[PDB]
Write a protein that binds this ligand. Sequence first.
Ligand SMILES: Nc1ncnc2c1ncn2[C@@H]1O[C@H](COS(=O)(=O)NC(=O)C[C@H](N)c2ccccc2)[C@@H](O)[C@H]1O
Ligand SMILES: Nc1ncnc2c1ncn2[C@@H]1O[C@H](COS(=O)(=O)NC(=O)C[C@H](N)c2ccccc2)[C@@H](O)[C@H]1O
Ligand SMILES: [Ca+2]
Ligand SMILES: [Ca+2]
Lengths: 441, 490
Amino acid sequence: RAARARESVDNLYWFMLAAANSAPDTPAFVTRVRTLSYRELRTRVDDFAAALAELGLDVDDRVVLEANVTPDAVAMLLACSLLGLPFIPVSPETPSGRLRSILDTAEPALFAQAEDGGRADVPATVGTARFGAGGLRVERAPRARVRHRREIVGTDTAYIIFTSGTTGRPKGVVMSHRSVVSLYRAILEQGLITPEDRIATTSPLQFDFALFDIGLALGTGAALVPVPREELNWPRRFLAFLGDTGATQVHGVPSIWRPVLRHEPELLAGLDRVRGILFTGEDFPLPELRHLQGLLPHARIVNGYGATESMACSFTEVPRPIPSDLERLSIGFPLPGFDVSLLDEHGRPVEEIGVAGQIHLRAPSMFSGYWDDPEATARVLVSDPLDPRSGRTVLRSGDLAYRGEDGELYFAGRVDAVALLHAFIPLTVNGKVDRADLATR
Amino acid sequence: RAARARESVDNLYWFMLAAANSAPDTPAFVTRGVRTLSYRELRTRVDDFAAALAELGLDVDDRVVLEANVTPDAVAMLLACSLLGLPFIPVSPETPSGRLRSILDTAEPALFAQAEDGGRADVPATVGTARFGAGGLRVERAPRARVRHRREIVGTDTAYIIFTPKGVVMSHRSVVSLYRAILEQGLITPEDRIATTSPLQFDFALFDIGLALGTGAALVPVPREELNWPRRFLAFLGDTGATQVHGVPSIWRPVLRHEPELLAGLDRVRGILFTGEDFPLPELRHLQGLLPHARIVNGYGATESMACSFTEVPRPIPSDLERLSIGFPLPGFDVSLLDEHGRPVEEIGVAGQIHLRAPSMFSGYWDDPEATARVLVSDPLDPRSGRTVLRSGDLAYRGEDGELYFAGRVDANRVEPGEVERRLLEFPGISAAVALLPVLHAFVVVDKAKARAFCADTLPGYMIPANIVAVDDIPLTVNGKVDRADLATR
Ligand SMILES: Nc1ncnc2c1ncn2[C@@H]1O[C@H](COS(=O)(=O)NC(=O)C[C@H](N)c2ccccc2)[C@@H](O)[C@H]1O
Ligand SMILES: Nc1ncnc2c1ncn2[C@@H]1O[C@H](COS(=O)(=O)NC(=O)C[C@H](N)c2ccccc2)[C@@H](O)[C@H]1O
Ligand SMILES: [Ca+2]
Ligand SMILES: [Ca+2]
């Protein structure tokens, strides 16, 4: 009786598990060294979907998935996907006060955590479950409800990413199945990755960088290599992990390299299997970037630029070697089927090389809105200033950029705007500079 | 310097000419003796038109009015506008100059294009002008010089705007999404020949062109001249080898009155598709009886989503059937019936307003954000997500299997005129019935006082037509719908 996305409708289930039909016995995950096959992953998703369907949740009903990137956590989000149940990924590190704030806003039907999970006292108004290879064990069944939705569509919400927005307000980026799949399709077209690759992923699941890495790898028929968040503090254990698992690509915010470059630059030079590194989140300090390049000279580095509101925007290979005169890394060209206007303060095109204007993004991968915040949505998703009467929307990015002589882009910071407004690093759960931490001094 | 949609971007050019790569030598068009145009020949025409259009320096989002009916050249033009991200505004040559000039003033296009033999002249100096045909695209007045500011064409770029002054803006990604949904349903194969009857300014034409070319089937444009005369129309369908015939219900009315024996003789016709309005059931049952080896499909939807549902009519049609079903939305489409408070109607037989979730949704009404905010709204089942649904302005109820039934516009002591006109059908000899509203006149295709008494039986006094007029045919709009307005005057 539960609704299920059809094979022909944009949906993470069908997008990520297509490799179960071409190459069922190929590795989807590498853990520690154990592989999990595409077929094994599909069975786990189908088992979780069968248990989830029993609960009587309507399409658009929200499941909080509290977990790090694990084979089980991905099986759960793909089982939420097939049933049109939007997943809200939460890091176990998240303090209980912030979870309870997301539970109050998002009003989910169910909170799901790993079998060995430590979260207690989730409110009585929300259902609770635990997942493992054992299956999905319900602790408290979700409320009785009448199912109103007959059919799952590609514009249905896949996931909501919750952060504290720039005011106090909880920021919930609502992303449709069709928006995410569109990003995955665009980046597959680039051909960064092959089925023979093993993607070491470092981001927490509540960061769409993790959602990028999962989709990129499974979409391609490659293997995902979740790096346990613990091993990242311990540079020798981190390099040992990448070596032992045969990781060919390492994805993470710039932060993940700082401990390794200070304490174990000799051992990093020893990872001969690594063909590629990908980063996003913030500027890669150029001294650390030139150091990292020097230590793995046969490894392509990709600068990934974009926001949660579109998942991503551009992927530019860092010049090898980095020019000795280079001021700034290029964020290159938007992906095929993506487009940027640089507009001045009045929304007029900037058409001078070297002059910064606000990025306005046209993309197939656009968010649907900010959870319960239509004012904020109307200030970010706006009438295209180059076509204001059509009703077409663009993303008013709040990011500045300028163009070089071949039309490539350069990030020039926030229009809101380590130095602060003083000169100084404490990291956010996502691996960013905790600028709010440093500003309290 | 001119931007061109890439092969990986949702775009009518790449969607409709995909068959040029798989089956270049297969027929894209059948015209009229009887000539085919191949997918390869069509594509070369599109590329030639795109090269001429690119010369003009138009930016992406700049509008081209395409005044033409469905022809090989008119389709080459809209596919050349598509590749260059130049939204096309289709206008029928039979549109009065009053209404064209109204579209040109609101749309403020960069270019007006018409056929070489085209009958338009009176075009403002602020708009460029060109003529397309054999040989190519002749510019008469070059459009204004401008700076090209858009670097790259994207799937959310406007493919076309349909004007009625109401402008439905439709993205490339929205249309292609409809084409993909209906391809999934497998209505048509590459062996088929689709006779299309709609004017190009009606998205039914845009439906038929994309359905056929998307599939790798052949399009058979029926010129309006061939359509008006029943035996000419059937001789055209026969001579071209049409296997599917698409049009509003009215394309069958002359043929069912004057030439039912000849219509029964179209053995190559495997399928008929209609939309626009209710097919009066007596004419529908007659048509089905005459071609029993032809599947009949009811297409339901509005321009705001191109379409919504495609339901095969029961074979044979029950003689006691009250209303034909608009069935289930396509895969990836979904309907709620909501009450006046946006509350789910969950009682069989109770009418509520259709709210549609679809991958094919319009971007907005040209220059009308107030109207856009009244039609494209917060999902009332999910108001906090920001997901938008189409407030359709169409009433409907469900049967026991969840199938839908159109119950009229919410526009339409209140008088439900679908209920007046439907109970006039039951009276014998009435094949079709318009009712309109001060006094309720009803006009019927086939004395009075028995039709009236037959009404007085099963209807309340205020829903009893004061005057019932027999007619030969119903006056049609350019798009082929009942001309309510025309009847109102007489
Ligand atoms: N390559 C950059 N250089 C420098 N500043 C940057 C850069 N990529 C973002 N940023 C900054 O970070 C913001 C985005 O923050 S976010 O919304 O949390 N999203 C992300 O951090 C990453 C994004 N979801 C993503 C995921 C996967 C692949 C690519 C991109 C941008 O608006 C920039 O201000
Ligand atoms: N099959 C119907 N029975 C009964 N009332 C109907 C029906 N199809 C529309 N309608 C009515 O006509 C309205 C839509 O009119 S429209 O916007 O001009 N669009 C069309 O008529 C054609 C539509 N775009 C289309 C094109 C191609 C394939 C399918 C559908 C609906 O809102 C209904 O009021
Ligand atoms: Ca423009
Ligand atoms: Ca709901």
